Ligand binder design. Structure first.
Ligand SMILES: Cc1cc2nc3c(=O)[nH]c(=O)nc-3n(C[C@H](O)[C@H](O)[C@H](O)COP(=O)(O)OP(=O)(O)OC[C@H]3O[C@@H](n4cnc5c(N)ncnc54)[C@H](O)[C@@H]3O)c2cc1C
Ligand SMILES: Cc1cc2nc3c(=O)[nH]c(=O)nc-3n(C[C@H](O)[C@H](O)[C@H](O)COP(=O)(O)OP(=O)(O)OC[C@H]3O[C@@H](n4cnc5c(N)ncnc54)[C@H](O)[C@@H]3O)c2cc1C
Lengths: 318, 318
């Protein structure tokens, strides 16, 4: 009766979480946005594909979004804390409601939950890769690469998730818009290299099957040195590679939401409700397209599900 | 050989068209954005649910987006003209390519097409409705209504598409967050009024079945006068109503793209390709959720389809 009971607990203050909050304030619904401080693109030099914010800093985008909320609305609060548990209460005075705990054992109660905790990229363990990541090595040539147009050469690291001909081809064709000399690095995979040479060789694409021993990031620029197992090396203007990802936190497991084979949390059309009623997902954790515009739209629809359910629960009571 | 051959013809300079253009410039693809000048929300006082742009002018959003493109990139051009035809050429020197004609019979040729021409709202023909539309009468209580919180009363016009109990209930529950006294106007529909009174009466909702003869917009504010067929009248703080829509232009018909029962152009997952190869759709014309965040994400994915196909067509050639 005196304990705050929020309409929604939003786990994540990234693009998805902020977008959910922005829809909820319009309908006077209450929520807490939890943000542990690390966001997937925090190391990115800019944000792309989001209207008006191209080539602008991604942290400024988040800050602008939060201020754009707090400057007018007062039903959404922001908690800069690290959550370690979320549960649907199965007993006690607030049975049926959801509860989150932070690392100091503080509690928040809510009618609904939006999971917006994002994913983390699982980087290849090639010496130097981590230091080249987001400098010379890009996850998506729509989000990066334009600034490297006219490079002497550009690379595709066709390993792990990208270790298929179709993926290598797809990424090589993107890279070809930026440079006249595309090289596909297959990192010891001779079979893939042969297929690249057979299919794309006639089109001016290079296959390189030597194992990469070290990647060296140039400080000035995107350009890197690629050092091979044989002691030789070369310079490349940039490299595209798409690491596999993993959903962050223990929350999905704790709630028992169903996962998809692709790895993201299974969603119910159209409000992205999970298999646990009253729990929704938005952003990278909730689809195979882990991009910013998807995060925005998913946040809006997740908010929609919250609004519809919370409204009905309140106003259907005489 | 000397005639420009764009990678994509983007029909529409709204949220969807601009978002497509913003993705295409990142990959150096060429396009023309056609904009006849009228956009669906041009009469809206502000834009909602789009991060950083809440409570800001929707025209400023578009202008910022276009400038944010033209200030850095040079592969996308904007044509302020009215198109009257789009065709996939079945003969001549550019057989297989797409072509658009404007009202002055000027031509543009392209490898692909993004249909982003939007929809138009089909307003009820109640005397005064058109003048109250976007002033006191709102299409969506997420996009409007917050500013009317605390109104003495708020209305639901449960006619046409909203002439079902579930729709009336859904909208009435949204309105109830903004006012203590919600009235559902059924405009001569006694059966719906009775169901509203049976179900929602105990919850404090009012049903009003009298035919509305005239709606009068107060100039200062959202408040309106509702004049009934019996000569009596009342004041209401706002009204929510969702007109049916219609896709704009002859383009869908000219191309022969498949339509859905809901009315929007049928889409192929995930790049929103229509049933005509090389033609994509984004925005209100392409889904049942005719909202801004949907327009943004659809534009990005439509651009994705263009990029994938155009890249393959170019670089697969030895
Ligand atoms: C280098 C890089 C560059 C990118 N560039 C672009 C681009 O230019 N354009 C684009 O559209 N996309 C880009 N992306 C993809 C984009 O960043 C994601 O799609 C987007 O960030 C997803 O938003 P999100 O809300 O799902 O996750 P995030 O933005 O990562 O936010 C996740 C939130 O969840 C919080 N959280 C996680 N665990 C906890 C916990 N236990 N307790 C409390 N809070 C927690 C986090 O603190 C954070 O606030 C890029 C990605 C990378 C890696
Ligand atoms: C009053 C009102 C308020 C709204 N408020 C919001 C809000 O706050 N937040 C939100 O997210 N959504 C809002 N919406 C919905 C939102 O406007 C739409 O989702 C969005 O505009 C769709 O974008 P679009 O690109 O598909 O169409 P549009 O933005 O309408 O753009 C259509 C483009 O196609 C062009 N075009 C059409 N025919 C031709 C032709 N023959 N030749 C050349 N060009 C042509 C047009 O000139 C125009 O440039 C509102 C809608 C209305 C009606």
């Amino acid at each position: 009766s005196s304990i705050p009971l929020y309409d929604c607990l939003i786990i994540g203050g990234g693009i998805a979480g902020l977008s959910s909050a922005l829809s909820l304030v319009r309908t006077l619904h209450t929520a807490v946005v939890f943000d542990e401080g690390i966001h997937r693109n925090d190391q990115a030099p800019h944000l792309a594909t989001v209207p008006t914010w191209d080539s602008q800093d991604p942290k400024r985008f988040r800050d602008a979004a939060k201020l754009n909320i707090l400057s007018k609305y007062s039903t959404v609060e922001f908690a800069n804390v690290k959550l370690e548990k979320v549960n649907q209460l199965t007993d006690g005075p607030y049975k049926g409601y959801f509860c989150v705990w932070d690392t100091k054992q503080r509690q928040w109660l809510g009618r609904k939950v939006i999971l917006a905790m994002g994913v983390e990229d699982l980087l290849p363990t090639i010496d130097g890769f981590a230091e080249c990541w987001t400098k010379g090595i890009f996850h998506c040539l729509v989000h990066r690469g334009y600034e490297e147009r006219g490079s002497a050469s550009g690379g595709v690291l066709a390993i792990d998730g990208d270790a298929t001909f179709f993926a290598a081809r797809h990424l090589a064709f993107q890279a070809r818009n930026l440079t006249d000399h595309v090289v596909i690095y297959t990192h010891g995979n001779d079979e893939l290299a042969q297929e690249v040479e057979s299919q794309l060789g006639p089109c001016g694409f290079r296959a390189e099957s030597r194992r990469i021993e070290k990647l060296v990031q140039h400080p000035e620029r995107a350009q890197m040195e690629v050092h091979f197992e044989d002691g030789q090396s070369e310079t490349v203007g940039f490299i595209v590679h798409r690491p596999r990802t993993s959903i962050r936190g223990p929350f999905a497991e704790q709630l028992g939401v169903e996962m998809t084979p692709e790895g993201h949390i299974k969603t119910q059309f159209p409000f992205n409700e999970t298999t646990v009623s009253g729990v929704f997902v938005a952003g990278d954790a909730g689809s195979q397209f882990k991009i910013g515009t998807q995060a925005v739209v998913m946040g809006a629809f997740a908010a929609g599900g919250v609004q519809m359910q919370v409204n009905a629960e309140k106003w259907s009571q005489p």
